[PDB]
Design an enzyme around this catalytic site. Structure first.
Site, PDB file in Angstrom:
ATOM      1  N   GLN A   1      65.982  37.643  47.303  1.00 52.23           N
ATOM      2  CA  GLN A   1      66.025  37.466  48.760  1.00 52.23           C
ATOM      3  C   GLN A   1      66.119  38.773  49.529  1.00 52.23           C
ATOM      4  O   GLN A   1      65.907  38.830  50.742  1.00 52.23           O
ATOM      5  CB  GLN A   1      67.168  36.525  49.145  1.00 52.23           C
ATOM      6  CG  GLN A   1      68.519  37.027  48.794  1.00 52.23           C
ATOM      7  CD  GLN A   1      69.582  35.990  49.031  1.00 52.23           C
ATOM      8  OE1 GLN A   1      69.767  35.076  48.239  1.00 52.23           O
ATOM      9  NE2 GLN A   1      70.293  36.128  50.136  1.00 52.23           N
TER      10      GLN A   1
ATOM     11  N   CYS B   1      69.313  32.688  51.306  1.00 53.94           N
ATOM     12  CA  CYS B   1      69.688  31.960  50.106  1.00 53.94           C
ATOM     13  C   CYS B   1      69.430  30.454  50.217  1.00 53.94           C
ATOM     14  O   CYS B   1      69.052  29.814  49.231  1.00 53.94           O
ATOM     15  CB  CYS B   1      71.156  32.242  49.755  1.00 53.94           C
ATOM     16  SG  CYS B   1      72.342  31.666  51.012  1.00 53.94           S
TER      17      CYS B   1
ATOM     18  N   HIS C   1      77.258  30.804  49.648  1.00 59.47           N
ATOM     19  CA  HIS C   1      75.995  31.140  49.023  1.00 59.47           C
ATOM     20  C   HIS C   1      75.345  29.894  48.441  1.00 59.47           C
ATOM     21  O   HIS C   1      76.017  29.058  47.882  1.00 59.47           O
ATOM     22  CB  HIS C   1      76.269  32.177  47.911  1.00 59.47           C
ATOM     23  CG  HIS C   1      75.034  32.745  47.267  1.00 59.47           C
ATOM     24  ND1 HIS C   1      73.976  33.260  47.989  1.00 59.47           N
ATOM     25  CD2 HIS C   1      74.722  32.928  45.961  1.00 59.47           C
ATOM     26  CE1 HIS C   1      73.068  33.739  47.154  1.00 59.47           C
ATOM     27  NE2 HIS C   1      73.497  33.548  45.919  1.00 59.47           N
TER      28      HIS C   1
ATOM     29  N   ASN D   1      69.951  32.335  40.452  1.00 58.49           N
ATOM     30  CA  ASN D   1      70.331  33.022  41.660  1.00 58.49           C
ATOM     31  C   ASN D   1      69.062  33.648  42.251  1.00 58.49           C
ATOM     32  O   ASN D   1      68.009  33.637  41.611  1.00 58.49           O
ATOM     33  CB  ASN D   1      71.384  34.086  41.317  1.00 58.49           C
ATOM     34  CG  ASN D   1      72.226  34.480  42.495  1.00 58.49           C
ATOM     35  OD1 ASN D   1      71.972  34.078  43.624  1.00 58.49           O
ATOM     36  ND2 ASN D   1      73.216  35.319  42.246  1.00 58.49           N
TER      37      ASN D   1
END
Lengths: 218, 218
Positions: free
Chosen positions: A19, A25, A159, A179
């Site tokens: 990102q 996110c 997150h 992630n």
């Protein structure tokens, strides 16, 4: 559900993305689940556009944060373009979804996994990847390199990531998290997060806010 | 629109099929247009199920005939399965669409091409294959082997086929038709039908009843 599952091995997960310096996110997590359900339903793994959500979900804040519900709703209403067609820029610009070609992948809607429960979580993850929220702001989470992470971390969600499987290793149950910090963080961009049993908020609050899209047609 | 177009060359047409001894031409024509639009929109050429329409479109008569409108509406409402999953049997059985896996390809709706007009016909065919009706019962049509067919045939529509392109040859304008009588009939299962100019019903009534599906999402 099975003892373990890995959607990456089942070809439902695209490569780890980054990102960058943009709080997108929420867009990455939503896109990963849509890429996953699209593959599960159609058999094709397409990389979808996080940039479209960043620019187009007017209920979110671009690079300053956003929501799981509004971004998933956006795809249910408008479909989403491929990243080839609408590439990521790590910045919010004007929504440019309309001037775009290629197909628009749509979902029928999305559901919330009954919170704070390992069993519900696994039951849903056994069917498709989930958009989940975690507290990733703590030093330990940021600097994670490998192994089954079990903190320390609280439950102050900040997150959004994607759960793509679960299993056990060295006497420890875990959840595989994708992630959006690139391939250099953690275990090639992933983290095996300790799985708390039963009724609990989960390690780093992982069982508190999980959603999954459903797609009935191609 | 261009001087000529061939969707077969553009990869939007699956191989010639054979309806056998079953009056399922209506299903074959609808399926060919859906296979075509799906490829044009998603980039993937999938072979869809004529059998599902035969068994499931309750407004049609299985092997005893059916309609362009009701079969296209069926796909718009319910989507259609792949032929791998729901293969053709040249007979009508109970609708078995629900016990079927794999994806269900759906269309948004369908439109009718303004009738009896070469220009409208070409304008629409330049965008995607069309489901068209023709009088194919006459001896000449049945025994066609090659060349630009221009009859004799009337306009007593009794057969549904798929228009997949047009062009000109030896000073003659034509329309490429994909029939469902197998690869041994005509030009490898196709027929180049003479194209009547302007305002007319078309050779064998080809401009009288043409429809095309539209698909907005994947």
């Amino acid at each position: 559900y099975p003892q373990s599952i890995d959607w990456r091995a089942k070809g439902a997960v695209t490569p780890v993305k980054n990102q960058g310096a943009c709080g997108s996110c929420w867009a990455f997590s939503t896109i990963a689940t849509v890429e996953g359900i699209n593959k599960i339903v159609t058999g094709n793994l397409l990389e979808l556009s996080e940039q479209e959500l960043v620019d187009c979900d007017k209920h979110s804040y671009g690079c300053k944060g956003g929501y799981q519900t509004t971004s998933l709703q956006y795809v249910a209403n408008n479909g989403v373009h491929t990243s080839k067609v609408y590439p990521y820029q790590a910045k919010q610009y004007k929504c440019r979804a309309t001037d775009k070609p290629g197909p628009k992948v749509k979902i029928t809607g999305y559901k919330r996994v009954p919170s704070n429960c390992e069993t519900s979580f696994l039951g849903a993850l056994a069917n498709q990847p989930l958009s989940v929220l975690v507290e990733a702001g703590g030093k330990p989470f940021q600097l994670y390199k490998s192994g089954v992470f079990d903190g320390p971390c609280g439950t102050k969600l900040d997150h959004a990531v994607t759960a793509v499987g679960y299993g056990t290793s060295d006497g420890k149950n875990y959840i595989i998290i994708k992630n959006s910090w690139g391939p250099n963080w953690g275990e090639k961009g992933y983290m095996r997060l300790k799985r708390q049993s039963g009724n609990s908020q989960g390690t780093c609050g992982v069982y508190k806010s999980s959603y999954y899209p459903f797609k009935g047609f191609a």
